[PDB]
Design a protein around this ligand. Structure first.
Ligand code: HEM
Ligand code: CAE
Length: 405
């Protein structure tokens, strides 16, 4: 379903990319998207899918657009429009200077100092899940570790019941990798139905959890409204549940296929941080956009007020102008260039959390299970969307090569 080309779109800039179902998904999600960076694709293209929208293809342009909130607004950050429209998360659907107060608050909940406080638990949980798997010689990494790990840590941070995981996870999924089962607004309303009562309760009888801290916060000298808290937490949930989960699967899928990369980390552990960055560049997985507030000529292309443009954070670090041999993993690149956690005023607040979770997993898994691979005759399927994913990751290993710690 291709929408008729708008009058202002030069036909030579058309390139029908479907962000939800790119062409050679078989090859991998990042490979599927990287087709946008082949020599035959202009820097800025218009696609007819998903109702019609611009896509910037190069790191240079993604960053500029992200810096420029005057022209590129976060008011409608998701494609298709109805989703971007229904989208009312904070601080994500806001521009500076308004955005800045809400951010300062979310920072209170997820920033560095929270991570540092939670460090021991993160380690405790990782060690426990891993040790628990070790003797089996086989898992479903996606259901077995990648979901539980990040998700339990969040449920802990938020002070919410683990029991709610399945329901929540479904709703969060519908948002980033729409199934067709429920529309964005519906999905938004259900999560919101979840949260409302919860917020009500923590406004009355505050705890020490993230939700209590948000429900009772100050923004611009005055108190946050019930709607504002619902809208902040809503975001906290989607980042909590859906980002780290997918990243780990990509990373582990790669590790499973590359013995020499594993060994490298085993023997020269001082490289883990460097490797974490490189993996963040290569298996980048978020693609959102902005809305043109007005008519604006950008790198010689005329954008019309109201036009949406996808600025794939995934793409920057995959761009050959930014990283020589992009599709190659090299733990010792001089410079790892990416915008995995975004760029501009919306830079990921949960970055410190994400990094800490990634580093622990690598260190801890490799410690106990140094040698592993993908299950014979398993065909790994990636999924595309706002947040890209892995459907399932069947791993196998020989117990006898594992190390109890
Ligand atoms: C692999 C991990 C993650 C990746 C790749 C990631 C990616 C991103 C991206 C690309 C943005 C900017 C979106 C925009 O500019 O439209 C963002 C913002 C955000 N993320 Fe992260 N995210 C990750 C983990 C997390 C975690 C663990 C949390 C906390 C629960 C979270 C919470 C946030 C918040 C609150 C914002 C918005 C900040 C603002 O608008 O000022 N993210 N993230
Ligand atoms: C990954 C994201 C793009 C960041 C802002 C919206 C989202 C879908 C959750 C956290």
């Amino acid at each position: 379903n291709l929408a008729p080309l708008p009058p202002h779109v030069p036909e030579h800039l058309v390139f029908d990319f479907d962000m939800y179902n790119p062409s050679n998904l078989s090859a991998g999600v990042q490979e599927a998207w990287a087709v946008l960076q082949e020599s035959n694709v202009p820097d800025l293209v218009w696609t007819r899918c998903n109702g019609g929208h611009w896509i910037a293809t190069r790191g240079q342009l993604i960053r500029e657009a992200y810096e420029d909130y005057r022209h590129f607004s976060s008011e409608c950050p998701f494609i298709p429009r109805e989703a971007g429209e229904a989208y009312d998360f904070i601080p994500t659907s806001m521009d500076p200077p308004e955005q800045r107060q809400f951010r300062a608050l979310a920072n209170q909940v997820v920033g560095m100092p929270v991570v540092d406080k939670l460090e021991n638990r993160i380690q405790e949980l990782a060690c426990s899940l891993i040790e628990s798997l070790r003797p089996q010689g086989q898992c479903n990494f996606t259901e077995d570790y990648a979901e539980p790990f990040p998700i339990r840590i969040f449920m802990l941070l938020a002070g919410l019941p683990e029991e709610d995981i399945p329901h929540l996870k479904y709703l969060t999924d519908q948002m980033t990798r729409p199934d067709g089962s429920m529309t964005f607004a519906e999905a938004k309303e259900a999560l919101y139905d979840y949260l409302i009562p919860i917020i009500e309760q923590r406004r009355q009888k505050p705890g020490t959890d993230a939700i209590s801290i948000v429900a009772n916060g100050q923004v611009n000298g005055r108190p946050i409204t019930s709607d504002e808290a619902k809208r902040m937490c809503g975001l906290l949930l989607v980042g909590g549940l859906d980002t780290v989960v997918n990243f780990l699967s990509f990373s582990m899928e790669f590790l499973a296929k590359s013995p020499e990369h594993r060994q490298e980390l085993i023997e020269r552990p001082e490289r883990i941080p460097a490797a974490c960055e490189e993996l963040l560049r290569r298996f980048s997985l978020v693609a959102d956009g902005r809305i043109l507030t007005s008519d604006y000529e950008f790198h010689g292309v005329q954008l019309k007020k109201g036009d949406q443009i996808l600025l794939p954070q995934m793409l920057s670090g995959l761009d050959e102008r930014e990283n020589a041999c992009p599709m190659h993993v090299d733990f010792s690149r001089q410079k790892v260039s990416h915008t995995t956690f975004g760029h501009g005023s919306h830079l990921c607040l949960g970055q410190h959390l994400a990094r800490r979770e990634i580093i622990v997993t690598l260190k801890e898994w490799l410690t106990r299970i140094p040698d592993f691979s993908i299950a014979p005759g398993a065909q790994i399927q990636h999924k595309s969307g706002i947040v890209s994913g892995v459907q399932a990751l069947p791993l196998v290993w020989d117990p006898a090569t594992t190390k109890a710690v």
